[model samples]
Target: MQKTLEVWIMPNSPQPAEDFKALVAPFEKAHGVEVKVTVLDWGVAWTKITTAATSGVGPDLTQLGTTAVGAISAMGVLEPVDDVLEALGGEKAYLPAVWRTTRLEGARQATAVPWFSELRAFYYRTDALKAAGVNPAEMFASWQGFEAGLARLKASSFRDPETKAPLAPLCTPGKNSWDVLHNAAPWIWGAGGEIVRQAGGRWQSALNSPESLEGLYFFLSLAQKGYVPAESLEKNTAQIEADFQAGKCAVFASGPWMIQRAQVPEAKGGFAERTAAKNLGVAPYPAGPKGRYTFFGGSNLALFNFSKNKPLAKELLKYLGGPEAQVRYAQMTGMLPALRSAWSDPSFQQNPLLRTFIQAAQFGRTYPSLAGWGGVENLAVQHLGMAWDLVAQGRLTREALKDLMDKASAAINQALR
Candidate 1:
């Protein structure tokens, strides 16, 4: 009988299953094995994956969000892939920042392999910056310059080149965003803060620390000071991105996917026909008082412990981890390749805008790797979201923000326990 391998992947591309089929075609033909790919939505992936983990009846291989790796690895249903990692050049093979997510906290063996990476960068309108007399170099060099640039852009009556619409100085998702926690990550880390810190052999919340408060204050002040649209505080990331593409906003932060979406044809639901598509620019996050940092996240590939095709699964993993496959898949998905060698490929090196992201990715950071991080992340999103609501109402004082952080810290501590 012929062997078959089932793989579950998130919709990372326009057609994930089709793209993956093409990616694995060579292996399928060489090994004479059938391969199947299933796409899962992020909303229900957790529930379905957990059910599969406990029941031991699902796809032979699966993709996991980097943040969820720790929690899922603790479930004891993932096959350790240390041997595969070694064969693929081990820890040194992939981007160092994402490699941290492939293993459980303090574990030497990896239960998954880093597949792709998503990191944040500042996207701005070239014309808006030029008309406002805001130098991209100076503005993005530090938080101080960034704020001054926003102030300049807001004060000036800069109009969009194509639509002539008045452009808001900045637009970012707020309370209603699905990525509330992710949106807050860069600010918190930029100020040298951690959402949760490992101390006393346990994960504990650190959102109330002095540095954390400074970061949160800076993030909210952009709205309070009238630089960012207050109404935008009610919108999500997708809506904000749409506003940006429509020339309604001058700048925002987003991941690599926006790059591809900006250039893809309008018929395919992209912004190619929009004004901002031709003028968009990418830059590293502005530096904070302590350091510059951004959120690092992506998906990892893992084999299930109950997989009936262990050898083929390992071979498939090995093929995916190679430089050629990494570069090709990343291009199709608009994500950064996880393999360190893949960055040297002409595909990435030749792109001027992508180079900014590749350089900035060196400073990427992720949440603490703990079995309870899922719970901690939920509480952080909840309390932080409430704080955003208060800010929108002009009722969130420093003390109030601190109080919310305190409550969040307490809840996170409980979750860790």
Candidate 2:
């Protein structure tokens, strides 16, 4: 009987199955093994994964979110990939920031292989900066510079090119986003706040810590200061992206996906054929009081402990981690490839904006690998989403921010317990 390998992946593109299938077609042909791909929606993925972990009945290979690795690995049903890493050119072959997410917290063995990277960086309009008399280089170099720059942009006479209305100084997603915690991560880390700390060998919530609250305060104050529009506060990620691409937003923070999106023709839903195309610029997050950090996120490929096709599974991983496959996957998904060596591909070298994201990956950091981190992330997302709404409504006082953080921390602690 012919051997078949079952693989599951989250939607990386509009047509996840076809995209993945095409990417691995060479593997299938080379290995002479059938590879079946399944695409799972992000919403109910966790429940399905946890159920699979418990039952030991699922795909032989699966794509796990970098954030989900810790929780799922704790279930103890994953095949360790330390040897796979060695076979794939060792730990030095991949981006260190993303490599950190593959190992379970405090575990020496890697349970997952870093696949692609999702990183955050600042996006600004070249014309907006020039109009505001803000030097692109110095404006985003430090926290002070960023604050002052935003103020200048807001006060400047720069108006929307097509609408003739004033461009908002900033754009951001709110409660409607699936990335509320992700959006807040850079600020917290930049301000020297650790999301959760371990004491007595147990995790404790740190969202209410002085440093964390400080970061949250500044982020929320952006809206209160009139830089971020109240209407933007209720919008989703797509809306904010649209606003930025339409010249309605002067600056925002996002990932590599936008870089590719901006290069597509406007009729095909991109800024390339529009005036906004020439204005697109990218920068790493400015240094904060403590330091600079961008939220490190991406998916990782993990082998199931129950897989019967272990050898073929390893072959698939090895093939996918190669430079050719990495670059192809990145182009298809608009994500950075995880392998550092893959970055040497001409595709990455030729793009100046992509270089920003590649370099920024060095400063990327991820949430702690706690089994209950999913709960913590959810709590933070819910509370912080509300905080953004409150900020938009002018109801988020310092006290209110503290109250929300405290509530989030308490709930997280209970979940951790």
Candidate 3:
């Protein structure tokens, strides 16, 4: 009764944050412990969390990046949730890919409860495809044909009703390297690229391998061929989304959040009835040489090993498996709930727009994990961005890019130690 369970969460989705506080009330009441929730902006969360984690004075249970469990476990600050998971329902209770992300590469036990999933896939416009004489229904079968179609679509004098300009064909969060990395990860996997993987005692960087190089090589070709926007090499995700809504691009990749953006008046901005579901379509990523895939991101729950109220901390995760709680999280957050039971819900299972994301996520892939946070946050997320910035400026040579990737991998591996 005198116990306390503190929690920290990223305020990425307002409804999820609000709903979580409300949903967790039962745990607080039943466990007789004070549940303190702190919502932090993602921009500051890295610093705030790392500081708290290292200082040993933070939340007893909290939300973590979908791919962060590997590094968090390496830090030796979190509890192994495998027993707790087996008690609740085991790995089969959640999506296979989502459940797989909860454990590190070499970890003995998964340490997180996959709470929510955000899946990114390609969205296309039907009318624009027809205007450009491209077949949205027939084409987009593979990367070779997909690129050709976009090239033709871009060269055509097709006018987009949303932007009153030529169709932009494709657009991405070009200015933000991290966003590019997220949406573009599948391209790497589909090209048979591998970033890093675990060995006996440490992590190894495979970015410069022929497989990985082909992935990055094919990815960089998009902007070079003028399929993507000229400004895309330096544009943020917000601007790219705005362009999509305004029809600046016939196609773009993003998360399921775009569903409301495509269907609603406020989201569509002044084109209420004209822009119904008929004009818009969501597609799984066009098949690459290897196969079809998309970037799937989400948050997982972690219990601090040092927590005095470990039982209550785990109780919070157990609550997520209930049908009602999973539904609330799915409906309120507009995210794919990790719970396999949620798949039975009609909202995503029946909706044409949303179901594509669900299907794509089933085959989603993640970058290889690092033994340290620095390996992931700095090397993959930061250093790679630096190299990409050079590529955008045309400052990086064909030779320089591979070297940088190898160099970044070494830097990342060092941190893993």
- lDDT against the true structure, each candidate: 0.87, 0.85, 0.72
Model 2 RMSD vs true structure? 1.5
Name the candidate, 1 or 2, with the larger lDDT value.
Answer: 1
In model 3, which regions exceed 4 Å deviation? Answer: 1-4, 15-17, 26-34, 175-177, 199-202, 267-278, 381-387, 390-400
Tens digit of lDDT per residue, candidate 1, span 1-417? 778999999888888889999999998999999898888887888888899999999999999989889988999999999998898898888766677888889876799988888888989999889989999999999999999999999987778877777798989988797678888888888888889988877778999998998899898878888888887998988898888988899899988888888878878889998879888898898899889887888888999999989989999999987778999899988888888788878877787778888878878888766778889889999999889888888888999999999999999888878
- lDDT for model 2, please: 0.85
Which lDDT value does model 3 have at 239? 73
Tens digits of lDDT, candidate 3, 1-417: 377778888875555467677887777777777777888787897788777679888888878887777777778888888876786578777766677777876567787887878788778888878877888645567887788778778778877654567867888765374565675577777887766765676567666777766777677657766777668767777677766766677888777777765566754352334432347778888787788777777888888887887877887777864566776776666677777777778888778878877777777776544446445545665655665676566665556768777777778667766
Ranking by lDDT: 1, 2, 3
Estimated TM-score per prediction?
A: 0.97, 0.96, 0.89
Q: Give the TM-score of candidate 3.
A: 0.89
Model 2 TM-score (2 dp):
0.96
lDDT of 1 at 76: 90
| Predicted candidate 2 versus true structure: per-residue lDDT over 44-72, tens digit per residue | 77788888899999989889999889988
**Residue pairs whose backbone atoms clash in candidate 3:** none
